From Swiss-Prot:
This is Cathepsin B. Glycans are attached at residue 176. The modification N6-acetyllysine is found at residue 204. The chain holds residues 81 to 333 of 339 of the full protein. Disulfide bonds join 77-106, 89-134, 125-191, 126-130, 163-195, 171-182. It comes from the Eukaryota. Coiled coil: none annotated. It comes from Homo sapiens (Human). The active site is at 92, 262, 282.
Length: 317
């Protein structure tokens, strides 16, 4: 083994090609002046590991809709619209986890009470359990740590929102070459069991605990029913070099190298011109894709999209 890290990103010919082929999506340049170490740490999820049981979806007598956008169902739970940034930290497994966890609280805690769960608290305080912090991690075990120990509040970098807000700064990858090259590097922040000054409750007071962690079957129908009945879920999929260039439409892998495994948050679905899809949000800001979101081919375990859906339900009262 010998992973060769370097640079010289996603060409134009890659974009141009993806277009001339006429797949269900159109490319463009998202990352500019970025180091391939960046693009890699961006995809920070290992695939498989410790699948949590199986939410035996009671599907039979549940006339699901043809299309659905969780942002439109629960409009009072804004966490659903929010797109985050993992920085050059393969903290995405922690991201899909807390992004959804955040929604579901507002949804199950009486669709009326929002809080941004700290991707920092989980990223830094979990441990081998979840894996390697910014170097990759197990989505399954994020949910599990939530249920296990809980997660305090904590919004975007320098947002000053919550117990522990993400201290890892984002890089302007979607812009200018005059600034510093975005090298995907750094280390995992140290687990500081303490909220920032200004915010009250304390840390222990602020910890939100889940009730259980579970796997949604590998079934389009089942996944749809988890999302409809309980809100967004967290999945994962293999990122090929062509995906980083996604701009709009329904993503279907055409060309590209197997960059790595990256986690996600599925919040909806639909059909875009005879092309069924899943409405998913990313952890690489609002400049990538369509306002941070992208649509991937549904019902074909495309890139493993429907094979790692883990979800959880919060503890009542």
């Amino acid at each position: 083994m010998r992973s060769r890290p370097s640079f010289h990103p996603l060409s134009d010919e890659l974009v141009n090609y993806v277009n001339k082929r006429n797949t269900t999506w159109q490319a463009g340049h998202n990352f500019y002046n970025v180091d391939m170490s960046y693009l890699k740490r961006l995809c920070g999820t290992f695939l498989g590991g410790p699948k949590p049981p199986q939410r035996v979806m009671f599907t039979e007598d549940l006339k699901l809709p043809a299309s659905f956008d969780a942002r439109e169902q629960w409009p009072q739970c804004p966490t659903i619209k929010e797109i985050r940034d993992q920085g050059s930290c393969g903290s995405c497994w922690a991201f899909g986890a807390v992004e959804a966890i955040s929604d579901r609280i507002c949804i199950h805690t009486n669709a009326h009470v929002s809080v941004e769960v700290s991707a920092e608290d989980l990223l830094t305080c979990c441990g081998s359990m979840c894996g390697d912090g910014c170097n990759g991690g197990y989505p399954a075990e994020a949910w599990n740590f939530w249920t296990r120990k809980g997660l305090v509040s904590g919004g975007l970098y320098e947002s000053h929102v919550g117990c522990r807000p993400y201290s890892i700064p984002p890089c302007e990858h979607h812009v200018n070459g005059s600034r510093p090259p975005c090298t995907g590097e750094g280390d995992t922040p140290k687990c500081s069991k303490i909220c920032e000054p200004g915010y009250s409750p304390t840390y222990k007071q602020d910890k939100h605990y889940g009730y259980n962690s579970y796997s949604v079957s590998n079934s389009e129908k089942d996944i749809m029913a988890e999302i409809y009945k309980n809100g967004p879920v967290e999945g994962a999929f293999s990122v090929y070099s062509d995906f980083l260039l996604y701009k709009s439409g329904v993503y279907q892998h055409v060309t590209g190298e197997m960059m790595g495994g990256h986690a996600i948050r599925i919040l909806g679905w639909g059909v875009e011109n005879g092309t069924p899809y899943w409405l998913v949000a990313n952890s690489w800001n609002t400049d990538w894709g369509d306002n941070g979101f992208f649509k991937i081919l549904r019902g074909q375990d495309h890139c493993g999209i429907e094979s790692e859906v883990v979800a959880g339900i919060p503890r009542t009262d």
